[PDB]
Design a binder for this molecule. Structure first.
Ligand SMILES: NC(=O)C1=CN([C@@H]2O[C@H](COP(=O)(O)OP(=O)(O)OC[C@H]3O[C@@H](n4cnc5c(N)ncnc54)[C@H](OP(=O)(O)O)[C@@H]3O)[C@@H](O)[C@H]2O)C=CC1
Ligand SMILES: CCCCCCCCCCCC(=O)OC[C@H](COP(=O)(O)OCC[N+](C)(C)C)OC(=O)CCCCCCCCCCC
Ligand SMILES: CCCCCCCCCCCC(=O)OC[C@H](COP(=O)(O)OCC[N+](C)(C)C)OC(=O)CCCCCCCCCCC
Ligand SMILES: CCCCCCCCCCCC(=O)OC[C@H](COP(=O)(O)OCC[N+](C)(C)C)OC(=O)CCCCCCCCCCC
Ligand code: SF4
Ligand code: SF4
Ligand code: SF4
Ligand SMILES: [Zn+2]
Lengths: 115, 90, 160, 111, 124, 359, 175, 139, 112
């Protein structure tokens, strides 16, 4: 048995610095395929926004301190890339990923039932 | 044993008369049944028109009125206890 | 044979073993398993005994309707069996049978309650489909169709 | 189908057993004391698109109020027509009472 | 009217009509439970706009039917035994006590049992 | 869309009906209303029915084309979208389309006439009879839809009947009837973006000189939602259109580059110039030979009329919605008709506009 | 303008035949619908245990082919989509894509409790509670699984509906 | 059961018009002893032909000509037709007939695709009753 | 434990921001005298101020948008429940069970 395309071994890193090199490397790999993501997924937006929204999700996890949290967020980091490259997700999923979208006043939420 | 069986010993519809002799002259294996069940034998008293009056079966030790205390045959509560042998007990 | 269960130890039947590990061998073994089934089926028709078909234990088996409508304790057990259920002593198990597809097994974890705590189902097709890559390596598209059929992939079991 | 006694009274005493066995949770029962004091149900639905046609409700009924008629030819154009409420199920019990007796007489002793 | 058609009563007031589609049941006008939705309000809905109300299911109300039965009267015994008149195809066997000077209905069937000595007062 | 189509969960109508909504606004929720979208099987009806049923508002959809209405039901939960067979030459059916409703919408209209209906019978007779019956059926709110140049004095038959249609509604239903006058609505499978993409456009120079303002069909659908659910819009007239001015001749050419279609456009018949007296003649013949709605005589007169904005009416800023420009939505509605895929943003489309007009 | 709009014209399914050109378009409807009813070619969209009963309809005992029913493996050659089995979330976008690729006229049948309303898996995290949330469904076959005769009753019911269509008389009268 | 002799004998026994109807809906020419007619009007036959295959010894003759609906078979006979019982519902013992205390009308077939299709509704009243407002005036 | 384990669970953010869980031990029921359901600690989520239950118009069902309405967790030690709640970063609040006060009961007390 052989692994599929763009696959990677799952190793639990033990050094903080080692992970960031993998994290930074992976970021361009997302950026490199951005035009192909638009072409393969027939996205209605230019590739510029595709590169735009990739960067934001990396920063969302920037400030994690404990190491065991760092690996799992990197293990799942690779998996989402691998599925995206190999055209495994359908066009419906990718559109809805980038098609996502100030809070109401207290009276307004109160008026319509709030939460 | 599972030896070959003459066709007229199987519960399927089979030809009679001149056509039986034709059937035996032309078939490769003359003892092969057509597979159409006998109308006069297969399911003839349907499941809803039987004659057997069913009675609930009860073995004596577990269905008796006497010598039938439940704690004797209460196996669900006599289950083997779970014991783990650590290194210390070994 | 390894763990005989449910009267499979009483009847006499043979098994067929291949030698080439190819689709033609598995075709022959299945056609033998047809005739060994027809050999067991006859014996069960001749050796069928009389008696209860279920445990004579109304705390795990519903009482007969006639006894339910006439005996007070039957009505209590009929009531608690169909609403509360029956409790299973705590522990766990791994029970395997010779399913027609292969070895099918369940890993049920009990907690002393009336609902299983865990139930993992080991479907033969799921373990077969993993080996598809290791087998199909070096074959043509018309040959893949044979390998799927020789595996017996009903995908309800694979995608349990 | 929901059945009746020969006298005409509904067989179900709103005991809610069938609702608790039902593996798919296809049954919805709402009950109270009737106008004359009887323990009767005023709401009884089966989500026929959620039932798995498994026969547990039939086995658990203490008074044989809920059964499964041998009918299979009732495919509907809209899915709303497959939400049988108490009016619908009692109309089936009247329609198929003779055929239910055919099956009950035959398979009474085996249960 | 809509006064009887929307409130439950032990007994009706006017004679029921089988053709009147607004009745709760073809043999009873008013509903027989406090929480039962009236049939007039139930069919005053958008989903019935283009339907044929005469062909919707209208089973006969079981409350009116069961009170058309005669009262069983027991002779020289104050306890009645009822089983649904089907044995293994009826309800569980329940014993009814008839000491009180009234007809005690069966819990399952709804048949009313009394004593013979009490019939004259009961039939008043 | 969003998550809740209302501003409050209790809404009292003109008729004293108190409608209480339940749920969070998803599929299983309800709003308590009950609309009736006429011509819901039409182009605009499908978007309007979808938005109402998406939030649990019961919608009665009168139909005549049995198959065309089937796809309407996917938008609503069980029992939400209801179907009533009807014909505008039948009154009983219309009196059942509006029997239980709390909102009546009238999208029925035509720019072509047929052997069984004329433009006079449809844009005027139907809308009148709907409003007369919707009033006698105790409906609190009526919303009507007309053309973008409703003017009873127009020599064109479409705007002659559309303009009179506005009057006969308020003269039948009363001074509460809202009115919507959308601009040419562009969307997937829209009648407007179709003839711009059609290859063999006979008489192209005659037809495509007409100037209009683009408008999103979804915004028209969402605008109709805000109007029905707001009682402050009763008796108000809305003129819905876009900001930037576009001409079909500009669009038919800007589209041409996106489609990427030397010798071929001339040989394939993309350009089919025609003397006008012939077009009046051929379109005359197809009125009684073709069995399908072809580009007829009355539509020809409209090509001589640019869009007019009745500045005394209201716009999207009254509804607090920003109108959507065709720049950002032209591309995604021509992908069906469309190395690296060539994607046009707002900047790409506007630059493409410059190239068409540059000699 | 002037519009003399009657009120008493019956709706199309009720309109009696009056002139000759009604029968001419009715005959073109019957001949067209009779062919579509008789060449009832479904699409092999079996997903789970409901598909086993679907194959048994084609078995010798019931023999769907004797009625002109031939299962086709492509949307191009199929006009009936039979949803036989559970529609999961992961399968849902594919089901819509396969549905869109069927040329008109097309009908969809929902077989069994999973397709109808989720069935046994109604409260699962990965099951669509009714395929009518994804595609329009023309008839619902109830059961788990529906018997082979129950599926044939659903097919027979749909054919009775297809023979009731008036696609061409609609143009002459409703249009 | 497929030979033209079996079709010839059944063709002659029935006569033209009975056999022409079977040549229109049944697709097969059969003849059998009449057992009974149900409330809708369908007639149920039984086949005595020694060559008829296992599941084809009973059949129906629907009332209509161009159309047949399986829901038109009365429930009593629906069980007999499926080889579920040996006693037809017209030969029932009086101690086996169902006792109905309500009038029984003509059989109603499946009403889907019509206006008679059943409409579900909630049979329970709302669970909260809002205040019936009254105004009282201060002294 | 100390880690923000919720960042790997994939749970929606609203369980951290918008919902409140409760750690409690089920109380003894008045109707029955059994004392076994009150020996395991459980976690349940508070209901929603609107949209917890509403009547379905068509069939009178009980519709809900709360995806935690039928989720009850079981534990065997109080600490394990609190530790697990801490691990997920849940905004919980603990309900201390009442303890019945001992009172000796004597047969002879009916006269003395
Ligand atoms: N870009 C656009 O589409 C523009 C359209 N408008 C106007 O909006 C209104 C809605 O049209 P739209 O949805 O966009 O596209 P359509 O022209 O396809 O909508 C027409 C609707 O009216 C119905 N209709 C026509 N004649 C009859 C009739 N005798 N009986 C019953 N129904 C009839 C049609 O029913 P059926 O489908 O079954 O035939 C259809 O639903 C029209 O009046 C149009 O002039 C104004 C500005 C822009
Ligand atoms: C071969 C005969 C072709 C007849 C077609 C025809 O005559 O069709 C044309 C007319 C017009 O009606 P329409 O097609 O609905 O107009 C809609 C199309 N527009 C918008 C282009 C006008 O139809 C009739 O008057 C049909 C009467 C019956 C004629 C005999 C059949
Ligand atoms: C070569 C033949 C091609 C057509 C063959 C099938 C036609 C068909 O099936 O046409 C079906 C038609 C229509 O049915 P109808 O009973 O008039 O329907 C309406 C019932 N009225 C009369 C009460 C309104 O029947 C015929 O009378 C067809 C006669 C023309 C041939
Ligand atoms: C170039 C092409 C060549 C021709 C192609 C052939 C097409 C096949 C024909 C389709 C038949 C069909 O469909 O017949 C069945 C259909 C559908 O009947 P239904 O749906 O039950 O409604 C019809 C019955 N009613 C309305 C009463 C309920 O009509 C019929 O019952 C027709 C009944 C009258 C037939 C008169 C025929 C006159 C003689 C014709 C020959 C001399
Ligand atoms: S047969 Fe249907 S309704 Fe009855 S218990 Fe089984 S799933 Fe529930
Ligand atoms: S089990 Fe029988 S008696 Fe009990 S609620 Fe169900 S139908 Fe009624
Ligand atoms: S409805 Fe029943 S038989 Fe059909 S796919 Fe679902 S579980 Fe299987
Ligand atoms: Zn009784």
């Amino acid at each position: 048995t052989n692994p599929t395309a763009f696959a990677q071994t799952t190793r639990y890193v033990k050094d903080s610095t080692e992970m960031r090199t993998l994290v930074l490397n992976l970021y361009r790999r997302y950026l490199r395929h951005s035009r192909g993501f638009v072409n393969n997924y027939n996205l209605d937006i230019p590739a510029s926004q595709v590169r735009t929204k990739i960067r934001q999700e990396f920063e969302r996890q920037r400030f994690v301190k404990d190491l065991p949290l760092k690996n799992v967020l990197y293990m799942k980091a690779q998996m989402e890339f691998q599925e995206l490259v190999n055209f495994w997700k359908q066009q419906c999923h990718v559109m809805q990923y980038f098609e996502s979208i100030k809070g109401d006043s207290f009276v307004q939420k109160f008026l319509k039932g709030a939460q | 044993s599972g030896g070959p069986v003459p066709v007229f010993k199987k519960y399927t519809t089979g030809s009679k008369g001149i056509w039986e002799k034709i059937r035996q002259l032309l078939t490769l294996v003359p003892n092969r049944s057509t597979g159409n069940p006998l109308v006069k034998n297969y399911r003839v008293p349907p499941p809803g028109s039987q004659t057997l009056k069913y009675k609930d079966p009860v073995t004596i030790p577990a269905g008796d009125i006497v010598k039938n205390q439940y704690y004797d045959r209460d196996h669900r509560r006599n289950y083997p206890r779970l014991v783990a042998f650590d290194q210390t007990k070994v | 044979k390894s763990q005989p269960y449910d009267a499979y130890d009483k009847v006499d039947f043979d098994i067929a073993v291949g030698t080439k590990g190819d689709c033609y061998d598995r075709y022959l073994i299945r056609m033998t398993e047809f005739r060994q089934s027809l050999r067991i089926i006859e014996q069960c028709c001749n050796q069928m005994p009389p008696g209860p078909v279920k445990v004579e234990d109304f705390k795990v088996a519903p009482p007969p309707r006639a006894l339910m409508k006439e005996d007070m304790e039957a009505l209590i057990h009929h009531f608690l069996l169909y609403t509360k259920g029956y409790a299973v002593p705590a522990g766990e198990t791994y029970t395997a049978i010779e399913a027609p597809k292969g070895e099918m097994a369940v890993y049920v974890v009990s907690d002393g309650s009336e609902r299983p705590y865990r139930c993992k189902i080991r479907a033969p097709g799921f373990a077969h489909l993993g080996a598809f890559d290791h087998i199909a390596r070096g074959h043509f598209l018309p040959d893949a169709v044979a390998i799927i059929g020789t595996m017996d992939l009903v995908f309800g079991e694979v995608d349990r | 189908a929901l059945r009746r006694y020969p006298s005409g009274e509904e067989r179900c005493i709103a005991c809610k057993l069938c609702e608790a066995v039902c593996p798919a949770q296809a049954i919805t029962i709402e009950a109270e004391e009737r106008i004359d004091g009887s323990r009767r149900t005023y709401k009884y639905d089966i989500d026929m698109t959620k039932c798995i046609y498994c026969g547990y409700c039939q086995e658990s009924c203490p008074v044989d109020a809920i059964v499964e008629t041998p009918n299979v030819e009732y495919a509907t154009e809209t899915r709303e027509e497959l939400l049988y409420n108490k009016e619908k199920l009692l109309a089936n019990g009247d329609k198929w009472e003779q055929e239910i007796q055919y099956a009950l007489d035959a398979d009474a002793p085996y249960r | 009217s809509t006064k009887e058609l929307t409130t439950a009563r032990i007994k009706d007031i006017s004679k029921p009509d089988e053709n009147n589609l607004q009745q709760q049941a073809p043999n009873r006008i008013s509903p027989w439970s406090k929480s039962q939705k009236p049939r007039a309000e139930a069919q005053d809905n958008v989903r019935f706009a283009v339907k044929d109300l005469a062909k919707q299911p209208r089973p006969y109300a079981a409350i009116d039917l069961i009170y058309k039965q005669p009262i069983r009267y027991i002779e020289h015994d104050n306890v009645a035994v009822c089983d649904g008149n089907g044995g293994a195809q009826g309800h569980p066997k329940v014993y009814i006590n008839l000491d009180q000077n009234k007809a005690i209905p069966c819990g399952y069937c709804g048949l009313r049992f009394a004593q013979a000595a009490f019939k004259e007062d009961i039939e008043s | 869309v969003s998550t809740f189509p209302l501003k409050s969960d209790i809404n009292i109508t003109k008729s004293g009906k108190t409608l209480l909504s339940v749920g969070q606004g998803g599929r299983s929720s309800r709003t308590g209303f009950t609309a009736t979208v006429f011509g819901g099987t039409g182009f605009l009806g499908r978007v309007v029915v979808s938005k109402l049923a998406k939030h649990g508002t019961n919608v009665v959809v009168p139909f005549r084309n049995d198959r065309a209405r089937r796809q309407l039901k996917v938008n609503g939960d069980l029992g939400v979208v209801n179907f009533v067979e009807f014909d505008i030459r039948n009154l009983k059916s219309i009196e059942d389309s509006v029997k239980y409703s709390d909102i009546v919408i009238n999208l029925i209209g035509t720019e072509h006439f047929s052997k069984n209906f004329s433009i006079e019978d449809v844009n005027i007779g139907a809308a009148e009879r709907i409003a007369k019956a919707a009033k006698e059926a105790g409906v609190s709110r009526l919303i009507h839809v007309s053309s973008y140049n409703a003017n009873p004095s127009s020599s064109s038959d479409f705007y002659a009947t559309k303009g009179i249609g506005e009057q006969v509604v308020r003269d039948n239903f009363g001074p509460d009837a809202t009115i919507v006058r959308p601009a040419p609505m562009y969307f997937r499978n829209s009648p407007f973006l179709n003839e711009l993409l059609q290859i063999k456009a006979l008489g192209g120079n005659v037809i495509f000189k007409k100037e209009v303002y683009p408008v999103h069909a979804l915004q028209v659908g969402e605008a109709i939602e805000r109007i029905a659910f707001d009682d402050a819009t009763a008796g108000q007239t809305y003129e819905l259109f876009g900001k930037e001015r576009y001409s079909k001749k500009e669009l038919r050419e800007m589209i041409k580059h996106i489609i990427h279609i030397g010798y071929y456009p001339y040989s394939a018949g993309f350009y089919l110039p025609a003397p006008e007296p012939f077009l009046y003649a051929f379109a005359l013949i197809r009125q009684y030979i073709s069995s399908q709605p072809r580009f007829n005589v009355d539509q020809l007169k409209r090509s001589h009329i640019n869009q007019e904005i009745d500045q005394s009416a209201k716009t999207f800023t009254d509804l607090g919605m920003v109108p959507d420009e065709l720049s950002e939505y032209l591309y995604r509605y021509v992908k069906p008709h469309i190395q690296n895929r060539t994607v046009y943003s707002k900047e790409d489309i506007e630059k493409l506009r410059d190239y068409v007009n540059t000699p | 303008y002037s519009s003399d709009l009657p009120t008493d014209i019956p709706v199309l399914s009720k309109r009696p035949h009056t002139n000759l050109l009604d029968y001419t378009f009715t005959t073109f409807d019957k001949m067209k619908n009779w062919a579509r009813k008789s060449s009832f070619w479904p699409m092999t969209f079996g997903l789970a245990c409901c598909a086993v009963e679907m194959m048994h309809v084609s078995a010798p005992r019931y023999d769907q082919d004797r009625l002109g029913i031939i299962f086709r493996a492509s949307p191009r050659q199929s006009d009936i989509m039979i949803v036989a089995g559970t529609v999961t979330n992961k399968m849902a976008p594919a089901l819509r894509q396969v549905y869109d690729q069927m040329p008109y006229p097309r009908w969809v049948i929902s077989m069994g409790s999973c397709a109808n309303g989720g069935g046994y898996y109604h409260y699962s995290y990965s099951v669509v509670r009714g395929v009518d949330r994804i595609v329009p469904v023309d008839i619902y076959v109830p059961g788990c699984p529906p018997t082979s005769e129950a599926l044939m009753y659903g097919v027979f019911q749909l054919q009775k509906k297809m023979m009731d269509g008036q696609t061409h008389r609609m143009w002459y009268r409703s249009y | 059961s497929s030979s033209i002799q079996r079709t010839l004998r059944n063709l002659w026994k029935n006569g033209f018009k009975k056999s022409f109807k079977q040549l229109q809906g049944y697709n097969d020419i059969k003849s059998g002893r009449l057992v009974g007619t149900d409330s809708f009007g369908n007639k149920f036959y039984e086949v005595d032909d020694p060559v008829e295959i296992h599941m084809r010894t009973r059949f129906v003759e629907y009332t209509g000509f161009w159309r047949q609906d399986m829901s038109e078979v009365e429930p009593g006979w629906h069980y007999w037709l499926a080889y579920g019982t040996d006693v037809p519902p017209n030969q029932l013992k009086p101690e086996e007939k169902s006792v109905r205390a309500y009038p029984v009308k003509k059989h109603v077939p499946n009403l889907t695709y019509t206006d008679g299709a059943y409409v579900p509704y909630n049979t329970a009243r709302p669970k909260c009753a809002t205040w019936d407002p009254k105004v009282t005036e201060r002294p | 434990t100390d880690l923000a384990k919720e960042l790997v669970s994939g749970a929606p953010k609203e369980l951290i921001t918008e919902r409140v869980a409760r750690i409690y031990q089920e109380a003894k029921a008045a109707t029955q005298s059994g004392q076994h359901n009150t020996e395991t600690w459980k976690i349940d989520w508070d209901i929603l101020n609107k949209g917890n239950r509403w009547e379905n118009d068509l069939m009178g069902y009980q519709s809900s948008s709360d995806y935690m309405q039928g989720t009850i967790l079981k534990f065997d030690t109080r600490e394990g429940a609190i530790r697990f709640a801490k691990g997920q970063g849940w905004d919980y609040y603990i309900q201390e069970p009442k303890v019945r006060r001992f009172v000796k009961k004597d047969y002879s007390a009916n006269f003395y």
